[PDB]
Write a protein that binds this DNA or RNA. Structure first.
Ligand SMILES: [K+]
Ligand SMILES: [K+]
Ligand SMILES: [K+]
Ligand SMILES: [K+]
Ligand SMILES: [K+]
Ligand SMILES: [K+]
Ligand SMILES: [K+]
Ligand SMILES: [K+]
Ligand SMILES: [K+]
Ligand SMILES: [K+]
Ligand SMILES: [K+]
Ligand SMILES: [Mg+2]
Ligand SMILES: [Mg+2]
Ligand SMILES: [Mg+2]
Ligand SMILES: [Mg+2]
Ligand SMILES: [Mg+2]
Ligand SMILES: [Mg+2]
Ligand SMILES: [Mg+2]
Ligand SMILES: [Mg+2]
Ligand SMILES: [Mg+2]
Ligand SMILES: [Mg+2]
Ligand SMILES: [Mg+2]
Ligand SMILES: [Mg+2]
Ligand SMILES: [Mg+2]
Ligand SMILES: [Mg+2]
Ligand SMILES: [Mg+2]
Ligand SMILES: [Mg+2]
Ligand SMILES: [Mg+2]
Ligand SMILES: [Mg+2]
Ligand SMILES: [Zn+2]
Ligand SMILES: [Zn+2]
Lengths: 36, 135, 248, 114, 69, 91, 98
RNA sequence: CAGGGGAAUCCGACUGUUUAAUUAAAACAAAGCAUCGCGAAGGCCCGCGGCGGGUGUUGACGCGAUGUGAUUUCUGCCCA
RNA sequence: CCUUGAAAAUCCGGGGGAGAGGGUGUAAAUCUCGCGCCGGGCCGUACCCAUAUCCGCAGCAGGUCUCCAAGGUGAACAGC
């Protein structure tokens, strides 16, 4: 599972996967979402 | 790879400033023979700006948009890293590691960190950084 | 010619429950909007011993849905629940040990803990340690559920009756022999004044129907009719049979 | 040996009648009536057995005449909660709120289909 | 009772309004100046003798300078 | 050395109460006073506090269990049956 | 087959690779950026599970949820003590892939 | 200061309790065993009276009513 | 421990932040810091507490709740 399962023979899962490469402010990403 | 970098927002886990949000100014992650552990120079806020509403008034809004800041050197084990990052241009010559010997310089570093936080608190950017963590 | 023991028990004076150190009435939370339509989450804060009761009590803290306050409940602890566990009460709560949810929204074989006798009161059935009630059958019409009580009797109750899922803790407490008269003394000192039981045949005729005689004998059938007046109905009251129960 | 007597009319060895031996400048042994042993606060978490540090252990009515510093610690929940459980709640608050963002984003990307 | 370590703080405690009296005690190895204030009796201990003579000369006027011998 | 041949823990009761009752209470008192392994922290500190109340000294987690054993055989099958009824209910 | 494969692989990580056992060391290795696989027993406290997963997300490292507990994870590592969290620095066995 | 001992029979298992002021016992109690009533509009009981009160801050692993009297081993036939 | 061994007055810490404070003054709101000023009313308080101050008709070998506790011998608050 996730974007790392390629490089691991065993099963790897992470609950916070979707937060990867997201350093932006959650309130402003929300504002963008309800804008669109 | 390594993620404790300048500009990264961390949460203070121990000390007087427990539960405060702060931004890493300098990371050492190697020791300095006087702090052999991995530590980082940190600029946080002591007092969060108060909630401001539309029916409040300019002077009261200005009074409530005031930030008290702190500068500290924290061991990594007392910091909780977050995924967020603020690119606030803190002056390194003012906010650096020699500032903890001279109290007058430390007031100067806290002053400089304060005004940069306040101007970034305006324009409504980086809202998560300037909100008190509820716990 | 004297008021017998058992008759004196109704006056209460000395035969009252020893409730000084009891921790409170163990009850489900009162049915409200949240529990009627969805679920409310509570946290198990402590599991405590209730004097005079062989079943642990669970202290569960809920959020008040209408005002900024914390509500503390005193649930009867189903076996397997631990401190720090989240328990969920309501119609929409899922099947887990400790959750409180109506019997009508349960599978046909689930076994419950603190069953409601009427749709709205708190738990009344299967409250003693190691006991449980089984859900037998629902019927979607007329909002009825049929359950099996610890005594083995079948009861028809409303589908809105709530119950805790699982078996009350305290396990096979009765399995251990008491051994010592003193252990029975401490057991009943926390309950009421009932333990040291003098046989009626060892009494005089004035204080018991079985008293008297030059040999300790009953002298009359110990089975007594249901309509016998108080002070007379002692022994086996309205007994359908006597003996040894060979067969079932 | 010089034997002692109670100095008050309470003649029973009750919890409020505890005494200690004192030698006066007059070179005689007398009873001094002690105060009960105070306890430090227990942590508000209710999960750790040790009592709080940095706070004086006195009887409850003595705390009225103590200064603020002697009754708390300079940290959030100081004098009410232990440091360890404060750290746990800081981390738990952040992680649970972050996980709320995950499920919010997860439905946002899953609602792209009609 | 409160103990005063050095000299000058003893002087203003001596010229406080509530300072009722000063008692001078000479021991075999020190001289104790005790000023009776409203709440405490403040004692200043000087091991050397000429300092004690200096202090007694410079005590504020209008205040009892009772000497214990 | 082996101090007792067979009484073991019920040696405190002496000759009193009958052999069968001492034998019957023997297994109960062994389970009742045993330290189980905690399923939460993994330590062998899970011991009985009162009847039906089991507490761990390490992680301070209190659980509701059996009178004498950590969990009764009935409750274990109860939990398995309730679980099975749960995935029957959903799909 | 996977249950015995990870245990067999975890054995070959020992005596043939660099690892580190324990919560405090694991966090230190993750934030130094040289942890590759972090293994958590299901016995792990839930807060500790979430914290390590958040750390791994920041450090781009895989988290494997072991199907045992700190006792039988310790036996899988060949140790006589409980291990609730461990990190692998290099494999020596290819439980991770290049 | 400070146990006479041994071989047996009867009864009660033991520890406990009892007729203050003639009976301390083999009597009562006891754990154990058995039976009976009762799912609350209920069982048992109090109450001149109140939909009053006790068990009951209780719910069959519980309350209430009896008999027998640890353990062991058994507990036969008779419902006229 | 099938026994889990009060309650309430009272005091305190924390969370939150409605508000208040002043315009750079020899400043404000405020202060659980130091010192200083004033007050604390009402009732009880002697003595016995027992082989003579209590109950038992009495200066009655009876009864009546507690605290302190030296040296020798000795296992010892035993006895001497
Ligand atoms: K009568
Ligand atoms: K008989
Ligand atoms: K302090
Ligand atoms: K005895
Ligand atoms: K006797
Ligand atoms: K009734
Ligand atoms: K019978
Ligand atoms: K017959
Ligand atoms: K017949
Ligand atoms: K405050
Ligand atoms: K008296
Ligand atoms: Mg009897
Ligand atoms: Mg008789
Ligand atoms: Mg009669
Ligand atoms: Mg008779
Ligand atoms: Mg007989
Ligand atoms: Mg008193
Ligand atoms: Mg002294
Ligand atoms: Mg006897
Ligand atoms: Mg017998
Ligand atoms: Mg007697
Ligand atoms: Mg007599
Ligand atoms: Mg006699
Ligand atoms: Mg028998
Ligand atoms: Mg009996
Ligand atoms: Mg505050
Ligand atoms: Mg007197
Ligand atoms: Mg006399
Ligand atoms: Mg008279
Ligand atoms: Zn704590
Ligand atoms: Zn544990």
């Amino acid at each position: 599972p996730g974007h790392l399962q390629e490089g691991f023979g065993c099963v790897v899962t992470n609950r916070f996967d979707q937060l990867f490469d997201d350093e932006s402010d959650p309130f402003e990403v929300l504002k963008a979402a309800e804008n669109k | 790879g390594k993620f404790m970098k300048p500009g990264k927002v961390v949460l203070v886990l121990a000390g007087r400033y427990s539960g405060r949000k702060a931004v890493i100014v300098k990371n050492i992650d190697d020791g300095t023979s006087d702090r052999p552990y991995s530590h980082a120079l940190v600029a946080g806020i002591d007092r969060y700006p108060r909630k401001v509403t539309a029916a409040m008034g300019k002077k009261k809004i200005a009074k409530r948009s005031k930030i008290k800041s702190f500068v500290k050197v924290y061991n990594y084990n007392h910091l909780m890293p977050t995924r967020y990052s603020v690119d606030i241009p803190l002056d390194k010559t003012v906010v650096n590691k020699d500032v903890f010997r001279d109290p007058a310089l430390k007031r100067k570093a806290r002053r400089e960190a304060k005004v940069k936080f306040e101007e970034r608190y305006k324009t409504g950017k980086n809202k998560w950084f300037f909100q008190k963590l509820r716990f | 010619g004297r008021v017998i023991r058992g008759q004196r028990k109704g006056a209460g004076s000395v035969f009252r429950a020893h409730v000084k150190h009891r921790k409170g009435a163990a009850r489900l939370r009162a049915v409200d909007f949240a529990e009627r339509h969805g679920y409310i989450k509570g946290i198990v804060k402590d599991i405590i011993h209730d004097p005079g009761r062989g079943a642990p009590l669970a202290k569960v803290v809920f959020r008040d849905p209408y005002r900024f306050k914390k509500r503390t409940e005193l649930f009867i602890a189903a076996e397997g629940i631990h401190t720090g566990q989240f328990v969920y009460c309501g119609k929409k709560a899922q099947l887990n040990i400790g959750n409180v949810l109506p019997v009508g929204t349960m599978p046909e074989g689930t076994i419950v803990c603190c069953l409601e006798e009427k749709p709205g009161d708190r738990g009344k059935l299967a409250r003693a340690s190691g006991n449980y009630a089984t859900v037998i059958s629902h019927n979607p019409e007329t909002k009825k559920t049929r359950v099996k009580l610890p005594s083995g009797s079948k009861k028809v109750i409303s589908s809105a009756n709530r119950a805790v899922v699982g078996v009350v803790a305290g396990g096979g407490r009765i399995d251990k022999p008491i051994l010592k008269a003193g252990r029975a003394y401490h057991k009943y000192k926390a309950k009421r004044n009932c333990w040291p039981r003098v046989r009626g045949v060892a009494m005089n005729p004035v204080e018991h129907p079985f008293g008297g005689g030059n040999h300790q004998h009953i002298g009359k059938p110990s089975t007594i009719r249901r309509d016998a007046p108080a002070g007379r109905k002692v022994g086996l009251i309205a007994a359908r049979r006597t003996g040894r129960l060979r067969g079932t | 040996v010089q034997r002692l007597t109670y100095r008050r009319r309470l003649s029973y060895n009750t919890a409020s009648n505890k005494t200690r031996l004192s030698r006066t400048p007059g070179n005689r042994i007398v009873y001094l009536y002690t105060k009960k042993v105070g306890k430090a606060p227990k942590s508000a978490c209710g999960v750790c057995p040790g009592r709080l540090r940095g706070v004086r252990a006195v009887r409850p009515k003595v705390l009225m005449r103590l200064s603020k510093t002697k009754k708390h610690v300079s940290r959030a929940y100081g004098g009410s909660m232990c440091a360890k459980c404060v750290r746990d709640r800081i981390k738990r608050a952040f992680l649970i709120e972050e996980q709320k963002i995950v499920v919010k984003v997860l439905k946002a990307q899953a609602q792209s289909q009609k | 009772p409160r103990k005063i370590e050095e000299i000058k703080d003893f002087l203003l405690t001596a010229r406080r309004k509530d300072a009722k009296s000063v008692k001078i005690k000479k021991n075999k190895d020190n001289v104790k100046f005790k000023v009776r204030c409203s709440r405490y009796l403040y004692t200043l201990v000087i091991t050397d003798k000429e300092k004690a003579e200096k202090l007694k000369q410079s005590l504020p006027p209008g205040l009892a300078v009772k000497e214990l011998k | 050395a082996k101090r007792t041949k067979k009484v073991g823990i019920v040696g405190k009761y002496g000759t009193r109460y009958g052999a069968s009752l001492r034998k019957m209470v023997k297994k109960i008192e062994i389970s009742q006073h045993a330290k189980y392994t905690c399923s939460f922290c993994g330590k062998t500190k899970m011991k009985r506090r009162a009847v039906g109340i089991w507490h761990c000294g390490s992680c301070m987690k209190t659980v509701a269990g059996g009178a004498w054993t950590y969990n009764t055989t009935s409750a274990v099958t109860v939990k398995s049956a309730i679980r099975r009824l749960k995935e029957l209910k959903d799909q | 087959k996977s249950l015995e494969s990870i245990n067999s692989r975890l054995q070959l990580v020992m005596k043939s690779g660099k690892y580190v056992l324990g919560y405090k060391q694991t966090l230190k290795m993750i934030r130094q950026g040289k942890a590759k696989l972090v293994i958590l027993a299901n016995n792990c406290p839930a807060l500790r599970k979430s914290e390590i997963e958040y750390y791994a997300m920041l450090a781009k490292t895989g988290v494997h949820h072991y199907s045992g507990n700190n006792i039988e994870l310790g036996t899988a590592c060949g140790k006589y003590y409980r291990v609730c969290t461990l990190a692998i620095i290099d494999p020596g066995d290819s439980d991770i892939i290049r």
